[PDB]
Amino acid sequence: GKPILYSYFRSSCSWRVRIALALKGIDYEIVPINLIKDGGQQFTEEFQTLNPMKQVPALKIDGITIVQSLAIMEYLEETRPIPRLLPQDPQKRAIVRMISDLIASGIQPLQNLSVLKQVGQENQMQWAQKVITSGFNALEKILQSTAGKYCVGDEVSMADVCLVPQVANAERFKVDLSPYPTISHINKELLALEVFQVSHPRRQPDTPAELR
């Protein structure tokens, strides 16, 4: 059977994996998990047995179940090598992983749904904006040394796969991107590639009709 991705249309972490799967040419099926309706499907007993962390994505592939988007992408990289998400040179690989982790560990978790719920309605917007602006202040500086056409040199990497979904989140939270011209430029360049379009939140099984 085809690999099965458990995804939510609006989920940044899910988008990451959908981009990687498109990049690697892997035909997969999606099982949508609605993260918001009736408290969220991620809390169901069935989904909790799939991922005790109660998050998407989860990928069933090659007879196993993998959670954590970067762990998934590293698995895909090791088993379906081309196109490469990571370059061959260990020093350049470290830079790609550094940027991916800055986003995936340093920004996204602090603006995740469950965290925003704990912050509360009155402060969640400002909180999300602060986390993202702080992260992008740093990332924009780093990209001055690392970026070519893309985040790390001239080939698409895992850092780019993390960048686009986090920038879309920045737009959703009404963050001013004008002080981040390099993030902005690279984001536009990546969005011109088919693998970032076919995988897009507005083209998902579970995209609400009003957003298609």
Residues at the annotated binding site for glutathione?
A: 11-16, 42, 56, 68-69, 108, 112-114
Taking the complex as a whole, how short is the minimal distance between the CB of residue 122 and its own copies, in angstroms?
14
Of 36 and 71, CB closest to its own copies: 71
CA 178 – CA 185 distance, rounded (Å):
11
Q: How far is the CB of 135 from ligand GSH (least distance, A)?
A: 11
- Sequence length of the chain is 212
Position among 54, 124, 168, 184 found at the interface with its own copies (CB under 8 A): 54
| Contact criterion met (CB below 8 Å) for 119 and 127 | yes
Tokens 């899910």 correspond to what residue?
14
Any contact of residue 69 with ligand GSH (CB under 6 A)? yes
Eight-class DSSP state of 5 = E
Interface with ligand GSH (CB under 6 A), residue from 65, 79, 105, 123: 105
Rounded Cα distance, 140 and 184, in Å: 9
Rule CB under 8 A: which of 84-103 touch its own copies?
Answer: 90-91, 93-95, 97-98, 100-102
Segment near ligand GSH (CB under 6 A), from 87-95, 103-111, 122-130, 138-146?
103-111
Task: Compute CA 170 distance to the chain's CA centroid, rounded to the nearest angstrom.
Answer: 12
In the chain, which residues are last before a break of more than 2.5 Å from C to the next N?
Answer: none
Q: Among 55, 187, 199, 204, which residue interacts with ligand GSH (rule: CB under 6 A)?
A: 55
Q: Binding string to its own copies for residues 141 to 160, with x set by CB under 8 A, is what? A: xx------------------
User: Are 131 and 170 contacting, i.e. CB atoms less than 8 angstroms apart?
Assistant: no
Distance CA 29, CA 7 (A): 10
Task: Give the range of 14-22, 24-32, 68-76, 198-206 binding its own copies by CB under 8 A.
Answer: 68-76
The helix (run of H) or strand (run of E) holding residue 30 is strand 29-32
Is residue 101 a contact residue for ligand GSH (CB under 6 A)? yes
